Amino acid sequence: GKLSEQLKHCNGILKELLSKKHAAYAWPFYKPVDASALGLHDYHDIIKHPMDLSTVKRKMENRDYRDAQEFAADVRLMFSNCYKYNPPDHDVVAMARKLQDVFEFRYAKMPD
């Protein structure tokens, strides 16, 4: 039941990250980065493993994640992609930092 319990905590975090409470800074992470639409023609040369909250949601719904660690690896991959691609002074990086702070502090309260 630990794995079930821990994955329910993960699902709770995911719902929070997608909630109106965090929408002001979470919105760039809702859907896959559309590189063409944003004119980011080097995005897929720099980012080899794209990740976003809609993909995390699909994987949770599909029971793709077997444990909390696998879930956290995708959420952190999403933030890492943002920190790798973008100049550190871009607004999206500040938004990533703020959403990661929400993630890390609640992920840390994982039930044992």
Ligand X SMILES: CCNC(=O)c1cc(-c2cn(C)nn2)nc([C@@H](C)c2ccccc2)c1
CB closer to ligand X out of 2 and 30? 30
Binding site for ligand X (CB under 6 A): 28-29, 33, 38, 40, 82, 85-86, 90-92, 95
Question: How far apart (Å, rounded) are the C-alpha atoms in residues 18 and 54?
Answer: 9
CB closer to ligand X out of 8 and 30? 30
Structure tokens at 45: 């040369």
- The least distance separating ligand X from the CB of residue 38, rounded to whole angstroms, comes to 5
Pick from 96, 2, 15: nearest CA to 61: 15
- The least distance separating ligand X from the CB of residue 78, rounded to whole angstroms, comes to 7
65: Cα separation from own chain's centroid: 14
